[PDB]
Amino acid sequence: YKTEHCDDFMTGFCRNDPGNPNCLEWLRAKRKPAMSTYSDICSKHMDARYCSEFIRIIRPDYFTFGDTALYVFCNDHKGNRNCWCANYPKSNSGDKYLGPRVCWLHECTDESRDRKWLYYNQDVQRTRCKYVGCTINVNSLALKNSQAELTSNCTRTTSAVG
Amino acid sequence: KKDGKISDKYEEGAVLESCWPDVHDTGKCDVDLFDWCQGDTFDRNICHQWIGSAFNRSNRTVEGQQSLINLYNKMQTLCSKDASVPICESFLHHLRAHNTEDSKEMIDYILRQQSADFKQKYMRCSYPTRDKLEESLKYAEPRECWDPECSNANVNFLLTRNYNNLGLCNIVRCNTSVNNLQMDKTSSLRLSCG
Amino acid sequence: GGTPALDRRVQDVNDTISDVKQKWRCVVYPGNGFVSASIFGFQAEVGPNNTRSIRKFNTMQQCIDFTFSDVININIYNPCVVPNINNAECQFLKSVL
Amino acid sequence: MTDEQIYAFCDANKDDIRCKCIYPDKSIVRIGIDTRLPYYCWYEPCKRSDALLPASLKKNITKCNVSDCTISLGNVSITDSKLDVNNVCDSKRVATENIAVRYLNQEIRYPIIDIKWLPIGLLALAILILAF
Amino acid sequence: RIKNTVNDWKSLTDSKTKLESDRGRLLAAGKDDIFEFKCVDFGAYFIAMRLDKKTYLPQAIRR
Amino acid sequence: AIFTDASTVASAQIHLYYNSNIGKIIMSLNGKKHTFNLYDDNDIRTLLPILLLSK
């Protein structure tokens, strides 16, 4: 797929099966037919792995195809919990967390969250977020017949905790 | 094409018609998509992808460069005329995404070239009232961080300084999270942030 | 075992203030009596024309009674901010603090 | 209540104790600026329970008295033990091992054999007829 | 019948419910509309969920 | 041994949740969850090297 000869056939062959390694390699060529075909594919199946690879491939040079796909998917799937950063469920405020405001909801700017769910303008501001507070992260906790407690009293003052 | 009709399928009597590979990159789609993306014929996907690809255009040919310069001039004129239209909202969004100094200057030019009604309807954050400005000095954190106007404003209509200040906010976040948990019958787990 | 029983229903101001500098303290004023002081200045009473005059206590008893009662001090005079005269009062406040 | 009614209440009586945090004297804010500590973090009327505060003032007050230190544990695995993580980053917090007791509202199971045993038990008694 | 099920499930359910009340208290910190009903898409169906205002646990419109 | 590319391999610690009622395996790797459908050929071809190269 270094030349535009297989573009016409692969346009349909990859709608048939988008997760194909050959279709993904066709998309790595980063030509307009491939990116538009996958923008159409992912505007319906943005919750599939090949859409993660698609968003990885296009950004940052051709983020527009992924942004249009995300817009379509998250206006169709209003109830998907993964579209609540790009399309906030509040009726009059869907653009609540667009742009640098993505940092104002710390579950959107997360390392456990796939960045196909954020617009590119949200994704580029995810590295400028300024956070103050006391966060505890545990990668895993396998506890058997053992009670555990994870408390983070963030105040500098020594509270009157009873 | 056959019988004056365009199709994607082949049948006997049809006539093939092919157009240039990466026809958009060559700048041959600039005029047609420019006067096709305004009005009831605006297709969000194709118009947005045309703008986005225009901002990342290969400059192999001089004619393509001239077409891109003409396209930016035409879009700047149209959006200085009125920036509420979907195509100018797309233009401002992609100018912001470009993140160069020239694109930021262009955003400021278009936004401050608007009319009074647009400024009062969409750019209340960029033009705070006297009361808000006087009450802003009482705080140390930027006005855009706590201003109710800037908490639901359209980000495309924020001036560059207000956009950056909206970025520079300290957000109080604490969380006690366990990514993976294997808790059996006789055991418990507790989480808190004060 | 464990920890002593604590009654939140009785408010202790010293629990919230984790910095010594910010606590209101009755200290000896060589000029006249005893005065309240902190990093925020001296506790003061409002004058006629919305001014501030440092409260003067003839004994430590009255200062301790006034500072730590349930009354709220809303009138604070700092000789290093509003007057900005930086006289011996400011240096005295610095030395006390 | 709403911000407009808040402003009306606080400018009708600018000397109200409740409406003192919202409209403080310029002396207080100037002292806070000089000390490099925001006035609403330490001003006593701002701490009053009945003191009304708008959205901006409360969301600025929330910034006061917050520490910035992060614990990132790995793959923790504990068995037949007890764990307790406290994010005390040398903040004058005494080491507390207070055991949290609760009211165990235990239901005692009773020694009731499944009454499906009642026929079988009868058969047991029946075999006494073999000893006759 | 009741005793066997109680022994099987009561302690698991109580510990898990306390943990998810903790998680929902952590999650609801700051959010204002987390206690109103939203239609959540679970792939094959929709559920009208919210966060319970008292126990901070997921709540759904019952049938 | 997880292959992050065609010719790159790294030793990684992963967690796996299997739900056999619906036929899906969720792998937590580097703090992120990847869901593999056990009825998908490509998901099978991606997950099987991870499972088999485990120890």
XYZ file of C-alpha atoms in Angstrom:
703
model
C 0.000 0.000 0.000
C 2.729 2.454 -0.981
C 0.696 3.462 -4.057
C -2.899 4.463 -4.771
C -3.709 1.320 -6.768
C -5.411 -0.688 -4.008
C -7.316 2.279 -2.562
C -10.582 1.633 -4.396
C -10.841 -2.051 -3.481
C -9.627 -1.630 0.090
C -12.229 1.111 0.615
C -14.912 -1.583 0.713
C -12.790 -4.513 1.854
C -11.952 -2.619 5.038
C -15.531 -1.647 5.756
C -16.185 -5.389 5.697
C -13.460 -6.001 8.316
C -11.827 -2.920 9.879
C -9.623 -4.750 12.363
C -7.729 -6.554 9.630
C -3.941 -6.108 9.864
C -3.921 -5.409 6.127
C -6.592 -2.720 6.499
C -4.707 -1.157 9.378
C -1.506 -1.210 7.299
C -3.471 0.407 4.464
C -4.444 3.133 6.928
C -0.796 3.596 7.999
C -0.201 4.876 4.465
C -2.117 7.953 5.711
C -3.803 8.812 2.426
C -7.176 10.524 2.250
C -9.274 7.502 1.129
C -7.983 5.377 4.018
C -8.536 8.042 6.656
C -11.988 8.937 5.326
C -12.999 5.266 5.178
C -11.922 4.808 8.781
C -13.571 8.060 9.846
C -16.796 6.600 8.467
C -16.112 3.222 10.102
C -15.302 4.743 13.507
C -18.239 7.157 13.483
C -20.281 4.000 14.119
C -17.815 1.731 15.965
C -15.677 4.179 17.948
C -15.807 1.738 20.884
C -13.720 -0.874 19.033
C -9.986 -1.470 19.234
C -9.228 -0.652 15.597
C -10.622 2.821 16.305
C -8.001 3.173 19.033
C -5.325 2.329 16.462
C -6.976 4.678 13.952
C -6.856 7.601 16.389
C -3.249 6.731 17.213
C -2.330 6.723 13.518
C -4.002 9.952 12.427
C -3.051 12.254 15.297
C -1.574 14.841 15.343
C -1.283 15.474 11.583
C -4.799 14.460 10.520
C -6.754 14.700 13.761
C -9.744 16.097 11.861
C -10.953 12.695 10.668
C -10.947 11.329 14.208
C -12.619 14.476 15.518
C -15.455 14.190 13.002
C -15.814 10.484 13.812
C -15.965 11.240 17.544
C -18.531 13.998 17.034
C -20.804 11.686 15.052
C -20.409 8.759 17.452
C -21.004 10.797 20.589
C -24.010 12.644 19.210
C -25.512 9.291 18.250
C -24.557 7.577 21.527
C -25.596 10.176 24.078
C -25.888 7.527 26.787
C -22.374 6.139 26.415
C -20.390 7.000 29.535
C -17.233 7.420 27.438
C -18.768 10.310 25.475
C -19.369 12.416 28.578
C -16.134 14.371 28.187
C -16.698 15.299 24.539
C -20.513 15.416 24.871
C -21.458 16.264 28.448
C -24.879 14.759 29.289
C -26.222 18.054 30.665
C -28.847 19.392 28.289
C -27.654 22.965 27.755
C -23.945 22.302 28.459
C -22.380 19.730 26.157
C -19.372 21.918 25.391
C -18.728 22.244 29.128
C -15.333 20.505 29.044
C -14.082 21.443 25.592
C -10.623 22.892 25.169
C -8.566 23.827 28.217
C -11.574 23.122 30.462
C -10.935 19.402 29.963
C -8.638 19.715 32.984
C -11.555 20.840 35.168
C -12.901 17.256 35.272
C -10.042 15.020 36.372
C -11.675 11.828 35.073
C -11.302 13.121 31.506
C -7.604 13.958 31.877
C -6.692 10.459 33.028
C -3.967 8.004 32.063
C -6.363 5.054 32.406
C -8.636 6.603 29.763
C -8.278 6.080 26.027
C -7.696 9.341 24.180
C -9.978 8.431 21.282
C -12.717 9.752 23.591
C -11.271 13.281 23.689
C -11.111 15.762 20.861
C -7.596 16.699 19.810
C -8.012 20.175 21.276
C -8.941 18.461 24.536
C -6.064 16.002 24.194
C -3.346 18.630 23.746
C -4.445 20.439 26.930
C -4.320 17.216 28.954
C -0.581 17.748 29.517
C -0.968 21.294 30.881
C -3.406 20.453 33.693
C -2.344 21.878 37.070
C -3.553 19.709 39.946
C -3.431 20.391 43.689
C -4.519 17.735 46.148
C -3.614 14.408 47.702
C -4.056 11.459 45.335
C -3.410 7.822 46.247
C -3.025 5.388 43.350
C -2.760 1.623 43.792
C -2.076 -0.358 40.632
C -3.507 -3.507 42.199
C -4.626 -4.747 45.603
C -5.001 -8.506 46.080
C -6.172 -8.809 49.680
C -7.387 -12.099 51.173
C -8.929 -12.259 54.661
C -7.408 -8.845 55.332
C -9.166 -5.543 55.951
C -7.583 -2.518 54.281
C -7.886 1.235 54.772
C -6.728 3.948 52.351
C -7.295 7.431 53.771
C -5.806 10.692 52.488
C -6.531 13.640 54.790
C -5.377 16.373 52.431
C -5.660 19.400 54.735
C -2.408 20.866 56.027
C -4.125 21.432 59.368
C -4.395 18.664 61.955
C -8.156 18.193 61.973
C -10.198 17.410 65.078
C -10.817 13.883 63.822
C -12.677 11.808 66.407
C -21.353 8.216 -15.675
C -24.148 7.178 -18.026
C -27.483 8.709 -19.062
C -26.456 11.897 -17.281
C -26.185 9.980 -14.001
C -23.183 9.395 -11.731
C -22.693 6.039 -10.017
C -20.051 4.016 -8.212
C -21.002 0.698 -9.829
C -20.059 -0.548 -13.293
C -22.564 -1.484 -15.979
C -22.436 -1.808 -19.747
C -22.553 1.501 -21.587
C -21.009 3.471 -18.721
C -18.164 5.963 -19.130
C -15.318 6.053 -16.621
C -14.386 9.396 -15.074
C -11.399 9.741 -12.748
C -10.119 12.840 -10.985
C -6.663 13.634 -9.736
C -5.184 11.634 -6.843
C -5.211 13.658 -3.626
C -7.289 16.211 -5.501
C -7.708 18.185 -2.277
C -3.958 18.504 -1.695
C -3.500 19.994 -5.164
C -5.910 22.794 -4.248
C -8.461 21.991 -6.958
C -11.248 21.551 -4.388
C -10.774 24.916 -2.676
C -13.225 27.012 -4.706
C -15.955 24.373 -4.943
C -15.830 23.354 -1.297
C -15.497 26.993 -0.222
C -18.698 28.101 -1.927
C -20.338 24.747 -1.117
C -19.681 24.760 2.631
C -21.717 27.931 3.247
C -25.470 27.719 3.664
C -27.867 24.777 3.576
C -25.269 22.713 1.675
C -22.802 22.671 4.597
C -21.770 19.073 5.277
C -20.014 19.026 8.632
C -17.827 15.990 7.966
C -16.530 16.953 4.539
C -16.191 20.658 5.300
C -14.349 19.972 8.562
C -12.062 17.409 6.931
C -11.393 19.821 4.069
C -10.386 22.560 6.517
C -8.269 20.208 8.611
C -6.458 18.829 5.581
C -6.018 22.396 4.331
C -4.136 23.261 7.513
C -1.776 20.318 6.903
C -1.340 20.807 3.163
C 1.718 19.620 1.264
C 3.402 22.491 -0.581
C 4.996 20.510 -3.416
C 3.542 22.740 -6.150
C 3.513 26.536 -6.305
C -0.073 26.569 -7.585
C -1.149 24.666 -4.479
C 0.594 27.243 -2.296
C -1.153 30.074 -4.138
C -4.512 28.334 -3.762
C -3.923 27.833 -0.032
C -2.957 31.486 0.455
C -6.074 32.560 -1.436
C -8.166 30.173 0.670
C -6.850 31.620 3.937
C -7.466 35.163 2.700
C -11.031 34.321 1.645
C -11.798 32.532 4.915
C -10.357 35.410 6.940
C -12.553 37.887 5.062
C -15.678 35.743 5.403
C -15.152 35.081 9.106
C -14.349 38.704 9.899
C -17.701 39.395 8.245
C -19.497 36.922 10.545
C -17.882 34.177 12.636
C -21.026 32.516 14.003
C -21.497 30.414 10.835
C -20.417 26.748 11.085
C -17.602 27.093 8.554
C -16.020 29.955 10.506
C -16.451 28.068 13.763
C -14.506 25.259 12.081
C -11.894 27.744 10.845
C -11.396 29.191 14.336
C -11.227 25.708 15.855
C -8.523 24.619 13.426
C -6.640 27.902 13.805
C -6.547 27.200 17.541
C -5.462 23.610 16.904
C -2.615 24.827 14.684
C -1.114 26.644 17.709
C 1.278 28.865 15.769
C 1.700 32.540 16.590
C 0.242 33.575 13.228
C -2.897 31.475 13.729
C -3.378 32.977 17.197
C -2.985 36.482 15.779
C -5.545 35.620 13.103
C -7.964 34.294 15.735
C -7.626 37.535 17.682
C -8.108 39.584 14.503
C -11.292 37.757 13.492
C -12.760 37.727 17.002
C -12.090 41.407 17.706
C -13.299 42.282 14.191
C -16.820 41.105 15.104
C -19.888 43.243 15.782
C -21.320 44.443 19.088
C -24.160 41.905 19.103
C -21.763 39.001 18.563
C -19.405 40.270 21.264
C -22.242 40.609 23.776
C -23.793 37.244 22.865
C -20.737 34.980 22.492
C -17.723 36.800 23.952
C -18.878 37.877 27.401
C -15.843 36.061 28.822
C -13.384 38.069 26.714
C -15.103 41.371 27.609
C -15.825 41.230 31.343
C -17.970 43.953 32.840
C -16.646 46.623 35.187
C -18.086 44.784 38.192
C -16.374 41.523 37.240
C -13.048 43.272 36.635
C -13.256 45.114 39.965
C -14.150 41.889 41.795
C -11.367 39.978 40.013
C -8.576 41.810 41.874
C -10.060 40.447 45.114
C -8.877 36.994 43.959
C -5.456 35.656 42.999
C -6.560 32.915 40.605
C -7.274 34.077 37.019
C -10.740 35.440 36.297
C -11.378 32.750 33.693
C -11.008 30.059 36.366
C -14.039 31.108 38.434
C -16.029 33.353 36.085
C -19.519 31.952 35.387
C -19.328 33.428 31.876
C -16.157 31.474 31.049
C -17.530 28.209 32.475
C -19.951 27.749 29.560
C -18.496 30.003 26.845
C -17.729 28.724 23.364
C -13.999 28.014 23.368
C -13.714 28.993 19.703
C -14.767 32.565 20.553
C -12.309 33.035 23.419
C -9.430 35.372 22.759
C -5.963 33.842 22.942
C -5.124 35.245 26.379
C -8.439 34.068 27.843
C -7.891 30.626 26.306
C -4.443 30.338 27.890
C -5.725 31.617 31.246
C -8.551 29.079 31.095
C -5.713 26.586 30.806
C -3.857 27.969 33.844
C -6.162 26.945 36.662
C -5.345 24.949 39.783
C -7.935 22.185 40.167
C -8.402 20.594 43.583
C -8.360 16.877 42.801
C -7.857 14.051 45.252
C -8.710 10.423 44.637
C -7.980 7.112 46.332
C -8.188 4.678 43.431
C -7.349 0.987 43.153
C -7.077 0.091 39.471
C -7.259 -3.671 40.042
C -8.886 -5.234 43.093
C -9.245 -8.857 44.219
C -11.280 -8.764 47.437
C -12.482 -12.096 48.806
C -15.369 -13.086 51.080
C -13.863 -12.222 54.468
C -12.091 -8.953 53.621
C -12.959 -5.311 53.024
C -11.480 -2.115 51.616
C -12.064 1.530 52.527
C -11.257 4.749 50.644
C -11.339 8.415 51.625
C -10.045 11.937 50.997
C -10.833 13.557 54.320
C -6.964 1.917 73.868
C -7.061 3.885 70.646
C -7.438 7.652 70.942
C -9.172 9.910 73.480
C -12.827 10.715 72.946
C -13.259 13.994 71.070
C -16.319 16.259 71.144
C -16.632 18.129 67.851
C -19.689 19.944 69.228
C -17.284 22.158 71.204
C -15.313 24.288 68.753
C -11.607 24.776 69.463
C -10.020 27.418 67.246
C -6.506 25.998 67.726
C -7.450 22.852 65.785
C -7.897 24.633 62.446
C -4.921 27.015 62.691
C -1.859 24.893 61.893
C 0.523 27.882 61.721
C 1.637 29.723 64.853
C 1.983 33.006 62.965
C -1.771 33.299 62.369
C -2.956 32.760 65.954
C -4.128 35.787 67.915
C -1.802 36.388 70.860
C -1.962 38.857 73.741
C 1.431 40.532 74.124
C 2.955 43.333 76.169
C 2.828 46.764 74.550
C 5.511 49.049 76.048
C 3.553 52.145 75.037
C 0.326 51.314 76.872
C -1.045 48.086 78.341
C -1.345 44.825 76.420
C -2.524 44.302 72.841
C -3.622 41.476 70.585
C -1.278 40.677 67.726
C -0.657 38.204 64.914
C 0.828 38.094 61.431
C -2.362 39.891 60.352
C -1.682 42.796 62.707
C -3.249 44.047 65.912
C -6.890 43.557 66.795
C -8.466 46.999 66.722
C -11.724 48.856 67.248
C -13.462 50.895 64.568
C -13.067 54.648 64.860
C -15.643 57.303 63.974
C -14.821 57.696 60.269
C -14.307 53.991 59.467
C -10.813 54.059 60.967
C -8.987 51.548 63.173
C -7.505 52.133 66.630
C -5.488 49.465 68.432
C -7.376 47.994 71.375
C -5.685 48.804 74.686
C -6.018 46.514 77.705
C -4.909 47.689 81.139
C -4.140 44.094 82.162
C -3.487 40.702 80.603
C -6.749 39.428 82.129
C -8.951 41.630 79.953
C -6.904 40.898 76.825
C -7.185 37.135 77.336
C -10.904 37.482 78.037
C -11.554 39.549 74.908
C -9.371 37.645 72.439
C -10.617 34.124 73.146
C -14.328 34.729 73.796
C -17.112 33.951 71.323
C -17.025 37.477 69.864
C -15.699 37.771 66.303
C -13.079 40.412 65.508
C -13.903 42.022 62.161
C -11.744 45.141 62.660
C -8.044 44.416 62.116
C -5.370 47.119 62.061
C -1.955 46.348 60.580
C 0.683 49.111 60.904
C 2.549 47.702 57.886
C -0.239 47.606 55.270
C -2.859 50.365 55.388
C -0.840 53.147 57.091
C 2.286 51.832 55.312
C 4.244 54.240 57.530
C 6.575 51.438 58.728
C 7.169 53.161 62.057
C 8.358 51.512 65.276
C 4.934 49.847 65.541
C 5.676 47.697 62.488
C 9.074 46.656 63.855
C 7.493 45.902 67.237
C 4.914 43.695 65.515
C 7.716 41.946 63.620
C 9.730 41.331 66.797
C 6.681 40.016 68.667
C 5.807 37.824 65.687
C -29.709 31.483 47.492
C -29.169 33.083 44.093
C -26.322 35.510 43.452
C -28.570 38.483 42.645
C -30.488 38.176 45.915
C -27.122 37.697 47.633
C -25.864 41.001 46.226
C -29.115 42.747 47.162
C -28.868 41.463 50.740
C -25.185 42.387 51.023
C -25.529 45.907 49.607
C -28.714 46.756 51.504
C -26.718 46.148 54.717
C -22.997 46.161 53.918
C -22.167 45.829 57.639
C -24.041 42.543 58.105
C -21.927 39.797 59.660
C -23.218 37.281 57.113
C -22.515 39.730 54.266
C -19.059 40.683 55.579
C -17.083 37.948 53.813
C -18.623 38.887 50.457
C -18.031 42.624 50.947
C -14.928 42.903 53.157
C -13.137 46.145 53.846
C -10.287 47.049 51.510
C -8.018 46.848 54.559
C -8.675 43.112 54.905
C -7.988 42.253 51.262
C -4.921 44.509 51.237
C -3.583 42.755 54.350
C -4.244 39.406 52.693
C -2.379 40.499 49.566
C 0.596 41.782 51.575
C 0.782 38.631 53.723
C 0.534 36.517 50.522
C -2.357 34.590 52.089
C -5.888 35.093 50.704
C -8.218 36.819 53.135
C -11.052 34.306 52.746
C -8.696 31.564 53.952
C -8.272 33.121 57.415
C -11.016 35.740 57.830
C -13.328 34.781 60.683
C -16.665 35.884 59.115
C -15.808 33.736 56.092
C -15.821 30.719 58.432
C -19.286 31.386 59.875
C -21.852 28.673 59.193
C -24.548 31.269 58.473
C -22.179 33.288 56.268
C -23.515 33.262 52.717
C -21.009 32.829 49.885
C -21.438 32.975 46.099
C -20.047 30.354 43.742
C -16.776 32.170 43.038
C -15.999 32.840 46.698
C -16.653 29.257 47.798
C -14.703 27.779 44.881
C -11.802 30.040 45.844
C -12.148 29.132 49.533
C -11.834 25.459 48.600
C -8.279 26.237 47.432
C -7.248 27.174 50.980
C -5.542 24.559 53.164
C -4.835 21.780 50.667
C -1.622 19.753 50.482
C 0.049 18.494 47.302
C 1.601 15.065 47.780
C 0.865 11.820 45.961
C 1.276 8.174 46.976
C 1.620 5.725 44.071
C 1.723 2.183 45.404
C 2.377 -0.738 43.100
C 0.936 -4.251 43.166
C 0.040 -4.504 46.847
C -0.817 -7.998 48.096
C -1.758 -8.649 51.729
C -3.120 -11.836 53.302
C -4.392 -12.523 56.831
C -3.218 -9.056 57.810
C -4.238 -5.392 58.067
C -3.297 -2.418 55.893
C -3.655 1.301 56.583
C -2.314 3.991 54.244
C -2.376 7.550 55.576
C -1.233 10.405 53.335
C 0.550 12.262 56.126
C 3.384 14.081 54.344
C 4.961 15.359 57.569
C 1.916 17.491 58.368
C 2.069 17.293 62.194
C -0.368 14.363 62.212
C 0.255 12.054 65.169
C 0.583 8.353 64.363
C -2.891 6.993 65.145
C -3.593 3.260 65.467
C -7.190 3.754 66.616
C -9.156 0.537 66.109
C -12.537 1.301 64.542
C -15.140 -0.687 66.451
C -18.667 -1.099 65.128
C -21.944 -2.588 66.273
C -21.786 -6.160 64.991
C -25.524 -6.769 64.672
C -24.943 -10.495 64.476
C -27.751 -12.976 63.898
C -27.051 -16.202 65.770
C -27.791 -19.301 63.716
C -29.797 -21.835 65.564
C -29.054 -25.589 65.736
C -32.056 -26.563 63.621
C -31.523 -29.706 61.580
C -33.206 -29.611 58.186
C -36.681 -30.972 58.915
C -36.293 -33.159 55.859
C -34.715 -35.402 58.523
C -38.107 -35.921 60.165
C -39.151 -38.909 57.982
C -35.740 -40.595 58.261
C -35.692 -40.141 62.025
C -39.103 -41.795 62.213
C -37.678 -44.755 60.299
C -34.966 -44.931 62.951
C -37.595 -45.326 65.652
C -39.340 -47.856 63.420
C -36.394 -50.244 63.492
C -37.076 -50.828 67.180
C -39.748 -53.208 65.875
C -36.878 -55.455 64.781
C -35.730 -55.775 68.407
C -39.176 -56.935 69.578
C -33.459 -21.757 52.711
C -32.863 -18.234 54.030
C -29.943 -19.177 56.287
C -27.900 -20.756 53.505
C -28.253 -17.703 51.250
C -27.494 -15.302 54.104
C -24.275 -17.161 54.906
C -23.375 -17.171 51.213
C -23.984 -13.553 50.296
C -24.596 -11.108 53.164
C -20.977 -10.326 54.095
C -19.772 -10.097 50.487
C -22.614 -7.736 49.677
C -22.038 -5.549 52.737
C -18.293 -5.183 52.148
C -18.771 -4.472 48.442
C -21.537 -1.961 49.166
C -19.350 -0.101 51.656
C -16.504 -0.018 49.129
C -18.759 1.320 46.365
C -20.261 3.890 48.725
C -16.675 5.030 49.292
C -16.059 5.092 45.538
C -19.258 7.056 44.934
C -18.401 9.561 47.648
C -15.037 10.051 45.955
C -16.684 10.286 42.529
C -19.404 12.757 43.543
C -16.942 15.251 45.062
C -17.417 18.444 43.069
C -20.078 17.230 40.652
C -23.522 18.788 41.060
C -25.696 16.881 38.562
C -24.485 13.410 39.585
C -27.675 12.998 41.649
C -30.130 13.454 38.772
C -31.297 10.736 36.419
C -29.387 10.152 33.194
C -30.069 7.486 30.589
C -26.948 5.318 30.525
C -26.301 3.016 27.574
C -25.124 -0.456 28.613
C -24.581 -1.811 25.111
C -27.706 -3.924 24.728
C -30.085 -1.773 26.796
C -30.625 1.590 28.463
C -30.987 2.221 32.188
C -32.139 5.412 33.914
C -29.401 5.709 36.534
C -28.142 8.243 39.040
C -26.151 8.338 42.268
C -28.142 7.889 45.457
C -28.033 11.064 47.523
C -27.737 9.206 50.850
C -25.629 6.082 50.279
C -23.776 7.442 47.210
C -24.537 4.218 45.331
C -25.788 3.640 41.775
C -29.564 3.909 41.591
C -31.860 3.022 38.713
C -35.512 3.422 37.817
C -37.171 0.148 38.805
C -39.632 -1.897 36.749
C 6.332 -10.597 27.109
C 4.105 -8.077 25.331
C 4.946 -6.947 21.799
C 4.234 -3.225 21.643
C 5.237 -3.216 17.955
C 6.150 -5.678 15.216
C 9.793 -5.967 16.319
C 9.732 -4.580 19.883
C 8.999 -6.646 22.993
C 8.813 -5.621 26.643
C 8.310 -7.519 29.874
C 5.115 -6.230 31.474
C 2.965 -7.117 34.475
C -0.689 -7.512 33.502
C -3.999 -8.377 35.123
C -6.744 -10.358 33.402
C -10.493 -10.545 33.999
C -12.300 -13.332 32.158
C -16.086 -13.340 31.806
C -17.083 -16.626 30.194
C -20.815 -15.892 30.237
C -20.308 -13.235 27.548
C -16.900 -14.446 26.350
C -14.607 -11.490 26.961
C -11.164 -10.960 28.484
C -10.212 -7.557 29.895
C -6.457 -7.059 30.223
C -5.252 -4.289 32.519
C -1.836 -3.294 31.166
C 0.015 -0.092 32.107
C -3.111 1.043 33.937
C -5.404 0.748 30.902
C -8.087 -1.833 30.135
C -8.137 -3.577 26.751
C -11.203 -5.703 26.018
C -10.672 -8.775 23.828
C -13.660 -10.548 22.309
C -13.114 -14.299 22.263
C -15.234 -14.594 19.097
C -13.015 -12.157 17.146
C -10.121 -13.584 15.143
C -7.947 -10.469 15.416
C -8.566 -10.128 19.154
C -7.653 -13.808 19.508
C -4.447 -13.331 17.510
C -3.523 -10.345 19.684
C -4.378 -11.874 23.070
C -2.949 -15.364 22.568
C 0.727 -14.245 22.401
C 0.204 -12.339 25.656
C -1.371 -15.333 27.399
C 1.076 -17.916 26.038
C 4.239 -15.873 26.664
C 3.175 -15.486 30.306
C 4.990 -17.078 33.228
